[model samples]
Target: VLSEGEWQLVLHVWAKVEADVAGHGQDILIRLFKSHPETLEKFDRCKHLKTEAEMKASEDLKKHGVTVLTALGAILKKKGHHEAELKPLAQSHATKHKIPIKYLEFISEAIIHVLHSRHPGDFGADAQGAMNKALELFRKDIAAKYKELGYQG
Candidate 1:
């Protein structure tokens, strides 16, 4: 469960970055790839774009970044109401993308890194803790849904 304080922190930070979703979104994805190079193996389509410039220039990468940011925005907009919105993605990722739950956790680290980089003053320990808790709350549901689909991870 996400506390009200946590929700406020998550929503506040997301609001700041939502305006430039494309740039920050790309940054988040790029950070993830840089932090865990092996994570690129998960995406056959994106894996070929080795360079950050290549990934940034690719429409496919932009779409992927937007998709992720949009979903996150929806979750913030509804304050957890969008967990249902995430179900289909969880299902698809489990069945088709075969994305492990661990990878999902891994990506959250990139989200945190981008937030801290963009808003060093605002993303203090309390804010970071709140964002982490909120993300974990969402991840818990996704992981449960993945298991419901009978995918081991």
Candidate 2:
């Protein structure tokens, strides 16, 4: 369960990143791509990018980044009280799209990294575990559906 204190810490940080969801989302996407270069091949638009410079030049990445962060914001806001929204989305992303669960896992890491790096005074070791746990809810939710759907990829 998400504790009250942890929820507040996460929500506080979420507010900061949500303030500039587009910018922060794009940055986290760039970081994720750098950490897992092969993950670029996961998307049709991004498969063509070869360099970090090229990545920065792609406006399409920014749009996709915005969409990704928006969805994540909703998930964090739910505080584990997921409604009907994310279930089908998660199922399709896994079963239909064949997105590797591992890469999705990295997105969670990139998000926390961006939050911690961008606003250290507001986010620190104190908020680290809460963020991880909050994001973990997203991962595990999708993962369970992936297993249920028999998606081994």
Candidate 3:
């Protein structure tokens, strides 16, 4: 059995992957937003209130991503099925993006390495599972949301 410290370290690694998902999620959103201006109202319009709005806008734009993965984590935790549900979601989401699911899996493995190195004896199983699930969900949600906004071929 691993100690609490190990669990905490793994959690941090998971957080990092979640952050990555949020960042990429922002990318997907922005791409969609350009085509569908309606998404702009989904967040604060003060993005341009500041001169360097571009910078904050960039980060704020990414917050949509963070919000998503965070919500996914909450849902999975609530259902007590985080790991079990993550695998298929990861596969489907990556496939939708034309991203190779194998590559997405590799990234989650690397995130696990970040935790594994810190905990030494810990395997970072939770972190990997969370990353995979978050990435998949991110892809799927973004695609569906954009499509609903009338995304074209």
Candidate 1, residues 53-86, lDDT tens digits: the string is 8878878777888899998888766666776788
Q: Point to the candidate with the largest lDDT.
A: 1
Candidate 3: stretches off by over 4 Å = 1-19, 46-57, 76-153
Ten-residue stretch with the least lDDT total in model 3: 46-55
Query: Which one wins by lDDT: 2 or 3?
Result: 2
Supply candidate 1's per-residue lDDT for 43.
73
Worst 10 residues of 1 by lDDT: 75-84
Angstrom error of the Cα, residue 72, model 1: value is 1.6
Over 4 Å off, model 2? none
Candidates, ranked, lDDT: 1, 2, 3
Query: What is the number of backbone collisions in each predicted candidate, taken in the order shown?
Result: 0, 0, 0
